[PDB]
Short mmCIF file of C-alpha atoms and ligand atoms in Angstrom, two decimals:
data_model
loop_
_atom_site.label_atom_id
_atom_site.label_comp_id
_atom_site.label_asym_id
_atom_site.label_seq_id
_atom_site.Cartn_x
_atom_site.Cartn_y
_atom_site.Cartn_z
CA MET A 23 16.52 -2.04 -0.86
CA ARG A 24 12.36 -0.53 -0.35
CA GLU A 25 11.45 -2.53 -3.56
CA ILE A 26 7.90 -3.08 -5.00
CA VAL A 27 5.37 -5.36 -6.49
CA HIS A 28 3.20 -4.30 -8.59
CA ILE A 29 -0.05 -6.08 -7.98
CA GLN A 30 -2.93 -5.52 -10.42
CA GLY A 31 -6.47 -7.02 -10.81
CA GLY A 32 -9.88 -5.98 -13.10
CA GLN A 33 -9.88 -3.94 -17.22
CA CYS A 34 -9.37 -1.04 -14.73
CA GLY A 35 -6.72 -2.72 -12.55
CA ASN A 36 -4.82 -3.76 -15.70
CA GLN A 37 -5.41 -0.32 -18.02
CA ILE A 38 -4.01 2.06 -14.81
CA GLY A 39 -1.00 -0.49 -14.26
CA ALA A 40 -0.16 -0.22 -18.10
CA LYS A 41 -0.26 3.40 -18.35
CA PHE A 42 1.71 3.63 -14.67
CA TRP A 43 4.61 1.06 -16.10
CA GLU A 44 4.50 3.50 -19.42
CA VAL A 45 4.67 6.57 -17.51
CA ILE A 46 7.32 5.39 -14.93
CA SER A 47 9.35 3.96 -17.70
CA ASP A 48 9.18 8.42 -19.91
CA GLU A 49 10.97 8.95 -16.11
CA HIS A 50 12.90 6.38 -15.69
CA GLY A 51 14.08 6.78 -19.11
CA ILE A 52 13.60 3.60 -20.69
CA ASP A 53 12.03 2.81 -24.07
CA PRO A 54 8.98 0.01 -24.69
CA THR A 55 11.58 -2.42 -25.21
CA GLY A 56 13.42 -2.43 -22.28
CA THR A 57 16.17 -0.63 -22.49
CA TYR A 58 18.39 2.51 -21.16
CA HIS A 59 18.14 6.13 -22.72
CA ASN A 60 15.84 -1.40 -8.67
CA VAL A 61 13.31 -0.42 -6.61
CA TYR A 62 10.73 -0.52 -9.55
CA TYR A 63 12.25 -2.35 -12.12
CA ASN A 64 13.66 -6.17 -12.12
CA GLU A 65 17.83 -6.15 -13.85
CA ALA A 66 17.28 -9.00 -16.56
CA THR A 67 19.52 -10.17 -19.51
CA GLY A 68 20.70 -8.50 -22.11
CA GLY A 69 20.17 -5.18 -20.30
CA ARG A 70 17.18 -5.58 -19.87
CA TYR A 71 14.69 -4.71 -17.22
CA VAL A 72 11.08 -6.67 -16.53
CA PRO A 73 9.53 -4.63 -14.23
CA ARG A 74 8.55 -6.52 -11.19
CA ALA A 75 4.54 -6.57 -11.79
CA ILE A 76 1.81 -9.76 -11.49
CA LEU A 77 -1.46 -9.29 -14.34
CA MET A 78 -4.89 -11.01 -13.33
CA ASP A 79 -7.62 -11.28 -14.24
CA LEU A 80 -10.35 -13.55 -14.77
CA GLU A 81 -10.53 -12.70 -18.74
CA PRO A 82 -8.38 -12.88 -21.61
CA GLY A 83 -9.73 -9.44 -23.56
CA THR A 84 -6.97 -7.59 -21.04
CA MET A 85 -4.31 -9.96 -22.21
CA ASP A 86 -4.92 -8.65 -25.56
CA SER A 87 -5.82 -5.10 -24.02
CA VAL A 88 -1.85 -4.81 -22.83
CA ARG A 89 -1.00 -6.26 -24.92
CA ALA A 90 -1.28 -3.84 -27.83
CA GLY A 91 -0.74 -1.22 -25.81
CA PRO A 92 3.44 1.04 -26.18
CA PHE A 93 5.26 -0.37 -23.47
CA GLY A 94 3.37 -3.60 -23.42
CA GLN A 95 6.92 -6.39 -23.95
CA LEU A 96 8.41 -4.71 -20.58
CA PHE A 97 6.00 -7.75 -18.79
CA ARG A 98 7.20 -11.53 -18.76
CA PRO A 99 4.49 -13.95 -20.03
CA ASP A 100 5.13 -15.96 -16.31
CA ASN A 101 3.12 -13.26 -14.41
CA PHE A 102 0.27 -13.30 -17.55
CA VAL A 103 -2.22 -14.82 -15.38
CA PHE A 104 -5.93 -15.70 -16.50
CA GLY A 105 -9.17 -16.92 -16.07
CA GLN A 106 -12.05 -17.86 -18.95
CA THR A 107 -15.45 -16.49 -17.33
CA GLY A 108 -15.32 -12.85 -16.39
CA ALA A 109 -16.89 -12.25 -14.06
CA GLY A 110 -19.56 -9.77 -15.11
CA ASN A 111 -20.41 -7.83 -12.16
CA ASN A 112 -21.09 -10.53 -9.89
CA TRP A 113 -18.96 -9.77 -7.00
CA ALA A 114 -19.37 -13.80 -5.45
CA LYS A 115 -17.63 -14.90 -9.29
CA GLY A 116 -13.82 -12.62 -8.14
CA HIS A 117 -13.86 -14.64 -4.54
CA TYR A 118 -15.46 -17.34 -3.67
CA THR A 119 -16.15 -19.86 -6.32
CA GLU A 120 -13.71 -19.03 -9.99
CA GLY A 121 -11.37 -16.93 -8.85
CA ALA A 122 -10.49 -18.97 -6.04
CA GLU A 123 -9.27 -21.49 -8.10
CA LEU A 124 -7.30 -18.87 -9.43
CA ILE A 125 -5.44 -17.56 -6.47
CA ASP A 126 -3.51 -20.43 -5.50
CA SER A 127 -1.75 -19.94 -8.45
CA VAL A 128 -1.37 -16.27 -7.92
CA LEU A 129 -0.23 -16.99 -4.41
CA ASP A 130 2.96 -19.09 -6.07
CA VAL A 131 3.39 -16.29 -8.60
CA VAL A 132 3.55 -13.60 -6.26
CA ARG A 133 6.19 -15.58 -3.89
CA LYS A 134 7.82 -15.93 -7.14
CA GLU A 135 8.97 -12.90 -7.03
CA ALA A 136 8.67 -11.38 -3.96
CA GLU A 137 11.54 -13.67 -2.56
CA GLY A 138 13.34 -12.17 -5.95
CA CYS A 139 13.65 -8.83 -3.20
CA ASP A 140 15.59 -8.49 -0.41
CA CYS A 141 13.90 -6.54 1.37
CA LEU A 142 9.96 -5.59 0.52
CA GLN A 143 8.87 -2.15 1.77
CA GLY A 144 6.01 -3.38 0.34
CA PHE A 145 3.11 -4.69 -2.03
CA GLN A 146 0.85 -2.07 -4.10
CA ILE A 147 -2.58 -2.59 -5.67
CA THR A 148 -4.82 -1.52 -8.65
CA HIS A 149 -8.17 -3.16 -9.10
CA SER A 150 -11.92 -1.27 -9.30
CA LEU A 151 -14.43 -1.89 -6.44
CA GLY A 152 -17.43 -2.46 -8.56
CA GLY A 153 -15.77 -5.48 -10.75
CA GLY A 154 -16.46 -8.59 -10.14
CA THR A 155 -13.02 -9.80 -10.66
CA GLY A 156 -11.17 -6.75 -9.37
CA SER A 157 -12.52 -6.02 -6.73
CA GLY A 158 -13.38 -10.29 -5.70
CA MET A 159 -10.14 -11.47 -7.18
CA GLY A 160 -8.22 -7.95 -4.76
CA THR A 161 -10.30 -8.80 -2.10
CA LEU A 162 -9.03 -12.39 -1.70
CA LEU A 163 -5.80 -11.88 -2.35
CA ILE A 164 -5.40 -8.90 0.17
CA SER A 165 -6.26 -11.19 2.79
CA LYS A 166 -4.02 -13.47 1.13
CA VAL A 167 -0.89 -11.47 1.42
CA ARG A 168 -2.05 -9.61 4.32
CA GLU A 169 -2.10 -13.76 6.45
CA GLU A 170 1.84 -14.31 4.47
CA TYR A 171 3.49 -10.87 4.86
CA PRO A 172 2.19 -8.70 7.70
CA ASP A 173 4.79 -6.98 7.77
CA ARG A 174 4.74 -4.94 5.08
CA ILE A 175 2.20 -2.40 4.33
CA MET A 176 -0.47 -3.02 1.16
CA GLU A 177 -1.39 0.15 -0.57
CA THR A 178 -4.54 0.54 -2.49
CA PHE A 179 -5.05 1.81 -5.22
CA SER A 180 -8.36 1.22 -5.12
CA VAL A 181 -11.42 3.49 -8.13
CA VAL A 182 -13.91 3.09 -5.79
CA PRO A 183 -17.63 3.47 -7.92
CA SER A 184 -18.83 6.54 -10.41
CA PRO A 185 -21.08 7.28 -6.94
CA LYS A 186 -23.89 9.46 -9.70
CA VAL A 187 -22.76 8.64 -12.85
CA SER A 188 -23.22 4.79 -12.71
CA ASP A 189 -22.15 3.06 -16.00
CA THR A 190 -23.66 -0.98 -14.62
CA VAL A 191 -26.34 -1.55 -12.01
CA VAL A 192 -24.64 -3.94 -9.50
CA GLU A 193 -22.21 -1.44 -7.97
CA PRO A 194 -24.07 -0.78 -4.30
CA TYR A 195 -23.46 -4.73 -3.82
CA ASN A 196 -19.53 -5.01 -4.45
CA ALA A 197 -18.63 -2.14 -3.72
CA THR A 198 -20.42 -3.23 -0.15
CA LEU A 199 -18.30 -6.42 0.20
CA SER A 200 -14.99 -5.45 -0.79
CA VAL A 201 -14.94 -2.47 1.58
CA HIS A 202 -16.20 -4.46 4.77
CA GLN A 203 -13.04 -6.37 4.07
CA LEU A 204 -10.43 -3.77 2.70
CA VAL A 205 -11.01 -2.27 6.15
CA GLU A 206 -9.20 -4.52 7.68
CA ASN A 207 -6.36 -5.94 5.73
CA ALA A 208 -5.54 -2.53 4.27
CA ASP A 209 -3.58 -0.10 4.87
CA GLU A 210 -3.95 3.32 2.24
CA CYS A 211 -7.32 3.35 0.40
CA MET A 212 -5.82 6.03 -1.60
CA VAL A 213 -10.38 6.55 -3.46
CA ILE A 214 -10.67 7.43 -6.81
CA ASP A 215 -13.90 7.89 -8.24
CA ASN A 216 -14.39 9.27 -11.88
CA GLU A 217 -16.76 12.02 -11.22
CA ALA A 218 -13.78 13.67 -10.02
CA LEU A 219 -11.68 12.88 -12.83
CA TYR A 220 -13.77 14.08 -15.54
CA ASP A 221 -14.17 17.54 -13.06
CA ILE A 222 -11.16 17.73 -13.00
CA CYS A 223 -10.62 17.01 -17.17
CA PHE A 224 -13.17 19.15 -17.66
CA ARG A 225 -13.26 22.49 -16.10
CA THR A 226 -9.09 22.30 -15.62
CA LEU A 227 -7.68 21.73 -19.24
CA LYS A 228 -10.61 22.28 -21.42
CA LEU A 229 -9.80 19.41 -23.16
CA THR A 230 -12.22 17.80 -25.93
CA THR A 231 -12.83 14.26 -25.90
CA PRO A 232 -11.63 12.72 -23.00
CA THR A 233 -11.23 8.85 -23.02
CA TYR A 234 -9.68 6.76 -20.12
CA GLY A 235 -6.35 6.99 -21.24
CA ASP A 236 -5.89 10.79 -20.19
CA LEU A 237 -7.74 9.73 -16.41
CA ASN A 238 -5.59 6.17 -16.39
CA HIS A 239 -2.56 8.97 -17.33
CA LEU A 240 -3.57 11.38 -14.89
CA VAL A 241 -3.55 9.13 -12.32
CA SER A 242 -0.04 7.11 -13.39
CA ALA A 243 0.97 10.55 -12.84
CA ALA A 244 -0.30 11.26 -9.16
CA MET A 245 0.58 7.39 -8.23
CA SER A 246 4.45 8.09 -9.57
CA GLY A 247 5.08 11.41 -7.72
CA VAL A 248 3.60 9.28 -4.55
CA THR A 249 6.43 7.39 -4.37
CA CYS A 250 9.46 9.35 -6.19
CA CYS A 251 10.72 11.06 -3.13
CA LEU A 252 11.75 7.88 -2.48
CA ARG A 253 12.59 6.99 -5.60
CA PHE A 254 14.90 9.61 -5.78
CA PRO A 255 16.65 11.79 -3.09
CA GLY A 256 15.88 15.13 -2.01
CA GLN A 257 16.78 17.53 0.65
CA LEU A 258 14.09 16.59 3.20
CA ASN A 259 13.48 12.15 2.29
CA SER A 260 10.27 10.34 2.88
CA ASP A 261 9.29 6.67 2.46
CA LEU A 262 6.02 4.33 2.08
CA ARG A 263 6.01 4.45 5.91
CA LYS A 264 6.67 7.86 6.70
CA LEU A 265 3.58 8.36 5.57
CA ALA A 266 1.87 5.53 7.19
CA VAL A 267 2.78 7.50 10.15
CA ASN A 268 1.99 10.80 9.73
CA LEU A 269 -1.62 9.97 7.75
CA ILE A 270 -3.41 7.03 9.84
CA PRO A 271 -4.14 8.26 13.84
CA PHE A 272 -5.82 5.02 14.69
CA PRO A 273 -5.42 1.56 13.03
CA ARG A 274 -8.89 2.08 10.52
CA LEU A 275 -8.56 5.63 10.18
CA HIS A 276 -6.56 5.39 6.54
CA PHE A 277 -8.65 6.08 3.73
CA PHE A 278 -6.99 9.05 2.24
CA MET A 279 -7.35 11.81 -0.91
CA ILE A 280 -5.87 12.40 -3.71
CA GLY A 281 -4.55 15.45 -5.22
CA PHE A 282 -2.21 15.80 -7.93
CA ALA A 283 -0.57 19.83 -8.68
CA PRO A 284 0.30 21.69 -11.59
CA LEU A 285 -2.63 21.60 -13.69
CA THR A 286 -3.75 24.30 -16.49
CA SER A 287 -4.72 24.19 -20.27
CA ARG A 288 -2.91 26.01 -23.30
CA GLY A 289 -4.66 29.35 -22.70
CA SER A 290 -3.93 29.40 -19.03
CA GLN A 291 -0.47 28.04 -19.10
CA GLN A 292 0.71 30.88 -21.25
CA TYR A 293 -0.05 32.94 -18.05
CA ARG A 294 0.94 32.12 -14.04
CA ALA A 295 4.34 31.34 -14.23
CA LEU A 296 5.19 28.75 -11.33
CA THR A 297 6.01 29.93 -7.81
CA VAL A 298 5.76 27.13 -4.95
CA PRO A 299 2.67 29.44 -3.53
CA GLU A 300 0.60 29.23 -6.68
CA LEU A 301 1.13 25.07 -6.55
CA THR A 302 -0.12 25.82 -2.71
CA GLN A 303 -3.53 27.55 -4.18
CA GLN A 304 -4.06 24.90 -7.06
CA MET A 305 -3.75 22.20 -4.95
CA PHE A 306 -6.40 22.96 -1.98
CA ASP A 307 -8.40 23.75 -4.16
CA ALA A 308 -11.22 22.11 -2.92
CA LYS A 309 -12.53 20.40 -6.96
CA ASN A 310 -8.95 20.23 -7.00
CA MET A 311 -9.01 16.66 -6.45
CA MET A 312 -9.71 12.95 -7.53
CA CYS A 313 -12.24 12.63 -4.24
CA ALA A 314 -16.45 14.05 -5.32
CA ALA A 315 -16.38 15.19 -1.81
CA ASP A 316 -15.35 18.86 -0.99
CA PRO A 317 -13.07 18.62 1.82
CA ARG A 318 -14.55 22.13 2.99
CA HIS A 319 -17.78 19.97 4.48
CA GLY A 320 -14.79 17.38 6.21
CA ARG A 321 -11.66 18.24 8.06
CA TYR A 322 -7.83 17.15 7.87
CA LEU A 323 -7.22 15.29 9.44
CA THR A 324 -3.64 15.31 8.74
CA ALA A 325 -2.25 15.77 4.83
CA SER A 326 1.41 15.85 3.46
CA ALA A 327 2.74 17.05 0.11
CA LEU A 328 5.29 16.08 -1.71
CA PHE A 329 7.07 18.25 -3.94
CA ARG A 330 8.86 17.55 -6.90
CA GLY A 331 12.10 20.39 -8.32
CA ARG A 332 14.28 22.36 -6.80
CA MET A 333 12.61 25.24 -4.81
CA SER A 334 13.30 27.10 -1.43
CA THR A 335 12.05 25.00 1.97
CA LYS A 336 11.42 27.98 3.31
CA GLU A 337 8.42 28.97 0.81
CA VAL A 338 7.64 25.90 1.22
CA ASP A 339 7.08 25.59 4.66
CA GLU A 340 5.87 29.49 5.57
CA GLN A 341 3.23 28.23 2.88
CA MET A 342 2.25 25.11 4.32
CA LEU A 343 2.39 27.38 8.06
CA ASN A 344 0.28 29.85 6.99
CA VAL A 345 -2.44 27.70 4.35
CA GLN A 346 -3.26 25.67 7.38
CA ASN A 347 -3.30 28.78 10.66
CA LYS A 348 -5.61 30.95 7.44
CA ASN A 349 -8.09 28.37 7.41
CA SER A 350 -7.98 26.82 10.64
CA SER A 351 -12.19 25.62 10.49
CA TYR A 352 -11.98 23.58 7.98
CA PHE A 353 -8.65 22.15 10.13
CA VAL A 354 -8.59 19.78 13.11
CA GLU A 355 -8.01 21.25 16.38
CA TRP A 356 -7.14 18.55 18.93
CA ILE A 357 -3.99 17.29 16.58
CA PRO A 358 -1.49 20.47 15.97
CA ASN A 359 0.26 21.08 12.70
CA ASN A 360 -1.73 18.26 10.86
CA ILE A 361 0.60 18.88 7.96
CA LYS A 362 3.22 17.62 6.48
CA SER A 363 5.91 18.53 3.60
CA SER A 364 8.69 17.03 2.20
CA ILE A 365 11.09 17.80 -1.18
CA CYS A 366 12.51 15.35 -3.95
CA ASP A 367 15.27 16.01 -6.46
CA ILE A 368 14.72 14.72 -9.68
CA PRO A 369 11.07 16.59 -11.12
CA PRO A 370 9.15 14.28 -13.78
CA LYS A 371 9.30 15.09 -17.35
CA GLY A 372 9.93 19.11 -17.84
CA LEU A 373 7.96 20.53 -15.10
CA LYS A 374 10.44 22.38 -13.71
CA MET A 375 8.02 21.56 -10.47
CA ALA A 376 5.80 18.72 -9.44
CA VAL A 377 3.28 18.65 -6.22
CA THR A 378 1.77 15.58 -4.62
CA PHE A 379 -0.79 15.66 -2.23
CA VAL A 380 -2.28 13.08 0.36
CA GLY A 381 -4.24 13.32 2.51
CA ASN A 382 -6.71 12.12 5.20
CA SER A 383 -9.72 13.83 6.11
CA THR A 384 -12.95 13.05 7.46
CA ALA A 385 -14.92 15.01 4.05
CA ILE A 386 -14.67 11.10 2.22
CA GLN A 387 -17.51 8.81 4.77
CA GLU A 388 -19.98 11.19 2.38
CA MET A 389 -18.87 8.50 -0.69
CA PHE A 390 -19.52 5.48 1.64
CA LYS A 391 -23.01 7.43 3.08
CA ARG A 392 -23.92 7.29 -0.13
CA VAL A 393 -22.97 4.02 -1.48
CA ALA A 394 -25.00 2.12 1.29
CA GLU A 395 -27.81 4.49 0.80
CA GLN A 396 -27.70 2.93 -2.59
CA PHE A 397 -26.94 -1.04 -0.74
CA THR A 398 -29.80 -0.58 1.64
CA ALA A 399 -32.34 0.86 -1.17
CA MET A 400 -31.20 -1.94 -2.68
CA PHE A 401 -31.49 -4.56 -1.32
CA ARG A 402 -34.23 -4.43 1.24
CA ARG A 403 -35.91 -5.65 -1.59
CA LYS A 404 -33.74 -8.30 -2.39
CA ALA A 405 -33.24 -7.60 -5.78
CA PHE A 406 -30.27 -8.88 -7.74
CA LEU A 407 -30.18 -10.90 -4.62
CA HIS A 408 -30.31 -14.75 -6.60
CA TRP A 409 -26.61 -14.02 -8.22
CA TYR A 410 -25.31 -13.66 -4.72
CA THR A 411 -27.58 -16.45 -3.20
CA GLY A 412 -26.14 -19.03 -6.23
CA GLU A 413 -22.62 -19.34 -4.96
CA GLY A 414 -22.83 -20.19 -1.50
CA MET A 415 -22.89 -16.69 -0.52
CA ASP A 416 -25.69 -16.27 2.51
CA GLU A 417 -28.00 -13.25 3.64
CA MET A 418 -26.35 -12.59 6.62
CA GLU A 419 -22.64 -11.55 4.64
CA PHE A 420 -24.32 -8.61 3.57
CA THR A 421 -25.98 -7.08 6.86
CA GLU A 422 -22.45 -8.01 8.33
CA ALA A 423 -21.06 -5.85 5.62
CA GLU A 424 -23.51 -2.74 5.96
CA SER A 425 -23.09 -2.78 9.69
CA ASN A 426 -18.66 -3.00 9.40
CA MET A 427 -19.44 0.16 7.11
CA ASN A 428 -21.46 1.68 9.57
CA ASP A 429 -19.42 1.40 11.81
CA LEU A 430 -16.49 2.33 9.76
CA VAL A 431 -18.22 5.58 9.09
CA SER A 432 -19.33 5.86 12.46
CA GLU A 433 -15.80 6.20 13.63
CA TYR A 434 -15.45 8.86 11.19
CA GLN A 435 -17.91 11.62 12.92
CA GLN A 436 -17.10 10.41 16.15
CA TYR A 437 -13.02 10.72 16.04
CA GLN A 438 -14.13 13.75 13.27
CA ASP A 439 -16.37 15.47 16.89
CA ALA A 440 -13.13 14.80 19.43
CA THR A 441 -12.45 17.77 21.07
CA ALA A 442 -10.29 18.59 24.03
CA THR B 30 82.88 21.02 19.53
CA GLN B 31 82.71 16.74 19.47
CA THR B 32 80.00 16.50 21.03
CA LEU B 33 78.53 18.70 17.98
CA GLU B 34 80.02 16.50 16.34
CA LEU B 35 78.76 13.58 17.34
CA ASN B 36 74.82 15.44 17.53
CA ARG B 37 75.00 16.43 13.99
CA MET B 38 75.20 12.83 13.11
CA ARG B 39 72.20 11.15 15.63
CA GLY B 40 70.75 14.52 13.87
CA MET B 41 71.43 13.41 10.26
CA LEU B 42 70.66 9.63 10.02
CA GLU B 43 67.85 9.61 11.94
CA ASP B 44 66.11 12.49 9.87
CA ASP B 45 67.77 10.24 6.80
CA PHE B 46 65.48 6.86 8.18
CA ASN B 47 62.60 8.70 8.32
CA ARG B 48 62.29 10.22 5.33
CA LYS B 49 63.39 6.76 3.50
CA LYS B 50 60.56 4.78 4.93
CA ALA B 51 58.39 7.19 4.07
CA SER B 52 59.29 6.39 0.85
CA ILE B 53 58.75 2.46 1.12
CA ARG B 54 55.24 3.85 2.85
CA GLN B 55 54.68 6.24 -0.28
CA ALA B 56 55.76 2.86 -2.89
CA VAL B 57 53.82 0.84 -1.17
CA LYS B 58 50.77 2.97 -1.05
CA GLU B 59 51.11 3.56 -5.01
CA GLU B 60 51.62 -0.24 -5.45
CA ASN B 61 48.47 -1.21 -3.98
CA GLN B 62 46.97 1.97 -6.06
CA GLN B 63 48.06 -0.01 -9.33
CA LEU B 64 46.93 -3.37 -7.53
CA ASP B 65 44.00 -1.57 -7.77
CA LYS B 66 43.62 -0.50 -11.86
CA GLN B 67 43.33 -4.36 -12.05
CA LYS B 68 40.03 -5.18 -10.32
CA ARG B 69 38.70 -1.52 -11.83
CA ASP B 70 39.73 -2.68 -15.12
CA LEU B 71 38.89 -7.02 -15.23
CA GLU B 72 35.27 -6.61 -13.83
CA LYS B 73 35.62 -3.92 -16.12
CA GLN B 74 36.58 -6.68 -19.18
CA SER B 75 33.99 -9.34 -18.55
CA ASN B 76 31.23 -6.91 -18.13
CA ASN B 77 31.60 -5.70 -21.57
CA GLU B 78 31.71 -10.05 -22.19
CA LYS B 79 29.24 -11.11 -20.52
CA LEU B 80 26.99 -7.49 -22.52
CA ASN B 81 28.43 -8.82 -25.82
CA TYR B 82 27.98 -12.86 -24.89
CA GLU B 83 23.87 -13.03 -24.15
CA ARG B 84 23.80 -10.38 -26.70
CA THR B 85 24.98 -12.60 -28.86
CA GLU B 86 22.33 -15.76 -26.36
CA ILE B 87 19.47 -12.99 -28.01
CA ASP B 88 19.94 -13.41 -30.91
CA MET B 89 20.20 -16.14 -32.17
CA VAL B 90 17.14 -17.30 -30.08
CA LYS B 91 15.11 -14.63 -31.95
CA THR B 92 16.26 -16.14 -34.95
CA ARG B 93 13.73 -19.10 -35.27
CA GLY B 94 11.30 -17.87 -37.88
CA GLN B 95 8.45 -20.05 -39.33
CA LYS B 96 8.77 -22.98 -41.70
CA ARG B 97 6.12 -22.90 -43.47
CA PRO B 98 6.51 -25.86 -45.64
N1 GDP C 524 -10.59 4.99 -15.02
C1 GDP C 524 -11.18 4.44 -15.86
N2 GDP C 524 -11.97 3.40 -15.22
C2 GDP C 524 -12.84 2.66 -15.88
C3 GDP C 524 -12.16 1.74 -16.37
N3 GDP C 524 -12.53 0.67 -16.57
C4 GDP C 524 -14.02 0.54 -15.52
N4 GDP C 524 -13.93 1.66 -15.72
C5 GDP C 524 -15.49 1.95 -14.19
O1 GDP C 524 -14.60 0.34 -13.71
C6 GDP C 524 -15.58 0.05 -13.25
C7 GDP C 524 -15.90 -1.77 -14.03
O2 GDP C 524 -15.38 -2.32 -13.46
P1 GDP C 524 -14.04 -3.34 -14.23
O3 GDP C 524 -12.56 -4.03 -14.60
O4 GDP C 524 -15.99 -3.09 -16.14
O5 GDP C 524 -14.94 -5.10 -13.78
P2 GDP C 524 -14.25 -6.37 -13.76
O6 GDP C 524 -13.49 -6.56 -14.69
O7 GDP C 524 -14.52 -7.16 -13.26
O8 GDP C 524 -13.32 -6.06 -12.60
C8 GDP C 524 -16.79 0.71 -13.70
O9 GDP C 524 -17.56 1.50 -12.93
C9 GDP C 524 -16.76 1.44 -14.65
O10 GDP C 524 -16.75 2.62 -15.04
C10 GDP C 524 -10.38 2.36 -17.00
O11 GDP C 524 -10.73 1.74 -17.69
N5 GDP C 524 -10.28 4.20 -16.95
#
């Protein structure tokens, strides 16, 4: 009955997964032992609950990571598959030689869990696109599972590489090789990049020392709010498929943007009473999204907004109408009423209102444009190319991947410029 | 007068027959209401008993530390 498996991958994917599971346990009132105080969790002996997630990585460090953090005992060792080497920023080490001998086993633990459900609404993945482990393994796994269950949808909660504040020197190769395959067998590539997360956590909460825990917690909140309207009843209910239908007009313009609301700090908290138009103004601000792409620099093909709490639906729909009608330039003409709404009935822990905004918008082709820029700048010199040539990989796959990337960005551009 | 004495006979007999049948139907409804409590309570008992037994099993399993000779 509309269940969801939660596959992870790579160190960042594993961190985000642990954070998401503890946040969901907080919302659903579970404690770090798995006792109350079917869509996500599974029942187990003694009234215990275990998350329906699998955890894969080539290095065993993340094992001790997810064991060390709170709510680490919710999981089950049958879903702790782990290699030994660790890709170490070698995408091929996660897709052809080393990752393969793991993914096979992972398939089992997927089908050891998929058939456990009865009406599987679809999967969801949490990983990075720069790290060899996450990117490569998750890409091969997407391939396998989309070959297996083509009927269900496969969300990919991916964190694209930090465009300007790079932490590794091999980001472009892995990002391009991953996107080339993700654009085919995925349905929801909601991109996140740490540039936007630091921007938000600095200039919207005045925080002191933002560690990765806080970014993971923020992405966790957004992840939850995305499907909470299905987890709970509502005056106007949605799901993981209504979103897909109302968000993509063509089989490959499915790359989204994510936004959360509300977010303020203590000083700004004591003011600014909570009311739906204020939430709208905070949600449609440019810098208030998880993507380092000023959305004004593009148009919104379409955008859905899921509210959580008790409100007045007329106010919701009228705010949506006003905001799509006043700023008609930034929205696209050849499609009408291009905004979408939904409303749940249970907000988060002690938050009388909550907004989660997901937008398919052609303002995000710039991210791929600049990543491909870095790629082509690093490729015409064959720099750091032996590390990949050594693994049976050739040089044709790279130019094919870059040409597919450029075909995708050309699709975005071409069917942005169109009219009626 | 005779035909009225007889029509009242028919009327009383029928308005007694119908009330009797309705009483039978209400008694059957009560019997089903009663039967429902059995499946309302046996399942509760079995649920609590499974809880107790499986909790005791979890305890007995977890109660395996180390020996250290
Ligand atoms: N929000 C967040 N981003 C991370 C985290 N860890 C790494 N990133 C970024 O993701 C990239 C590294 O990916 P990583 O998972 O370490 O490599 P992998 O082990 O091969 O999957 C780098 O761009 C990191 O900056 C994390 O824990 N939280």
